[PDB]
Swiss-Prot record:
Catalytic activity, EC: 3.1.6.1
Catalysed reactions listed for this entry: an aryl sulfate + H2O = a phenol + sulfate + H(+)
UniProt main location, coarse: cytoplasm
Organism field: Pseudomonas aeruginosa (strain ATCC 15692 / DSM 22644 / CIP 104116 / JCM 14847 / LMG 12228 / 1C / PRS 101 / PAO1)
UniProt temperature dependence: Optimum temperature is 57 degrees Celsius. Incubation that exceeds 20 minutes above 50 degrees Celsius leads to enzyme inactivation.
Protein name: Arylsulfatase
Cofactor remark from the record: Binds 1 Ca(2+) ion per subunit.
Binding-site residues for Ca(2+), renumbered to this chain: D11, D12, A49, D315, N316
GO molecular function (one): arylsulfatase activity
pH dependence per the entry: Optimum pH is 8.9.
Family per record: Belongs to the sulfatase family.
Residue pairs linked by disulfide bridges in the UniProt entry: none
Record's subcellular location: Cytoplasm
Required cofactor(s): Ca(2+)
Amino acid sequence: KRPNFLVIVADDLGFSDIGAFGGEIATPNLDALAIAGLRLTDFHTASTASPTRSMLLTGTDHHIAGIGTMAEALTPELEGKPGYEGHLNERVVALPELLREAGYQTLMAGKWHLGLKPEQTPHARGFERSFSLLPGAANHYGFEPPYDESTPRILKGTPALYVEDERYLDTLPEGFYSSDAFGDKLLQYLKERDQSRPFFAYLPFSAPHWPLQAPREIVEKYRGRYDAGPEALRQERLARLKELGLVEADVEAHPVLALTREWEALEDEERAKSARAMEVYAAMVERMDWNIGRVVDYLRRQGELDNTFVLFMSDNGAEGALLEAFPKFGPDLLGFLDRHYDNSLENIGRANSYVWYGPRWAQAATAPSRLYKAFTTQGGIRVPALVRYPRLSRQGAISHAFATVMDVTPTLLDLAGVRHPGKRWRGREIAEPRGRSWLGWLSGETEAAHDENTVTGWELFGMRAIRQGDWKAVYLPAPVGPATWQLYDLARDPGEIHDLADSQPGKLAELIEHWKRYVSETGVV
Ligand SMILES: [Ca+2]
C-alpha cells in the first residue's frame, strides 16, 4: 500500500513558536502530530524562501536548481550563470514530476516562489491541481497598494498574483485570507481526489510572513500576552526548550544583536505597537494551525492519515529584518506606508496595515541560535520540523540527528517505490540529489541518515557556511560580521559563540577545502 504524502511548510515561522517546540502560541493540531511523531532539532534549510523550496522539491542545492540567488536580487552580472535563472530550472526534475508519472495525484495550495511565468508555475512543474501565490509574499487579504513609479520595490515585487492551474486569477473571493484560502483549496482537492490512488499534497503557507495580518477574533486571544517584551519572551522560550528536552540545560544562548532600542528604552506607545505586532503574529500561527487541523482531521476521518507521511517544517529562520533598513526595498518605504496604510495601534493586523516584528522578537524564537533569516548562522538555517508516520519505528521522540531539506525528495521517492531517474529526464541533463533518504534512520536500522564525514554547504548574499559532521565554519561580511571565516563546534557550542579558527586552524583549513568543492560542484558565484 503506497503511502500518501502531506508536506506542510510554514513561512518564516520560528524554532520555538509551536507549543511542542516550546512556544506559548496555540498550535493544538501541530502539537498532536509532533508529540506522536518525531521532532527534529538539527534539521536545516537554506536561509530564505525560494532557495529552500528549490531544494525541498529536488533534493539538491539551490545554486544548481535555479535560485543561486533570489530572483528579486538578480544582477546583470549573474545573468547566464547556470543555476541563477531566477526560477526552478530544467537542470532539475521536481519531486511532483516524478511522482505524477508514477501514479500519484499531485495537489498544492499555497505560496510557490519558484517562478512567475506560465512555464514555471506549479501546473507546469508537476502539479495536477494547484492554487498558488506565485511571488514570495503578498497582502494576506489581497489589499493592493497603487503600483506606480513611487511604489517601494518590496511592494512592487509582492503583488497578490494568484493562479489556479493555468488560470491566472482576475479577482480574489470575498473573505479571502491566505491561510484559510489555502486550507479551503487543499481540502477541496482532497475531497475531489481519486480515492483509489495515493496523493502527494503540498501545503506551503505564506503565514506567518509579513505583512503581519490575521483575523481580529484570533488576535484578541493574545491581548496582553507579549506586554513583557521580546527578551522576557526569549527567556520563557529558552526555559521551555530545556524543560521539554529540545535543548540541553547547559547550552549558552547567543547574545541578542539589534541596532534598535531594547524594550525598556521604548516609550509606552512604541511598546504597545510592537507587542500588538507579536500578538498578530501569534494569531497568524494559530490560524495556520487551525487550517492544518482542517486538512489533517479530514484525512483522519477518511482513514487515510495513518498511511500518510506527514512532514511539517518552516522554510528558514524567523524574520528579524527591518525592511526600512534596506534601500533596495525603497524608495521611502516608511513614508509610503504612512500615506497608504494605517499602522496605528488599533488597526495593526488588518488588511490595510503593513508591519513586521523586527530583530528582537525574531531572536526570541531562534534562541539559543545566532541571528535569524537570511544569515548562514544556525538562526537562519536551523528550523523546526516534524515527521508523523506510524509505520516508521522512530516516533514519539526528539531527535538531534543532522538532517536537511535536501533529504526530503530522496526519502519520499524511497517511500513511493520510485527511483530517481539518474542524470537524464525528458530528454535533458538533470542533477542527482545531494541529500540522502531518511528511511534507514526512521525505521530504526541506523541512528542517523548522515555521519561525522557528511559535508554540506550554504551560500547566499555573500554569506557562507560549510559543515562536516558537527564542525561548521561561517563567513559573514561587513558590517554583519568580521569578513573572515569563523569556526564552531556545534556539539559543544550550538550558539556559535566561541570562534575556534585560531585555536583549530587545521580543522578550519579542512573545511575551507570542502567549501571550495561545494562552490565548484554547485556553481556558487
Ligand atoms: Ca520564508
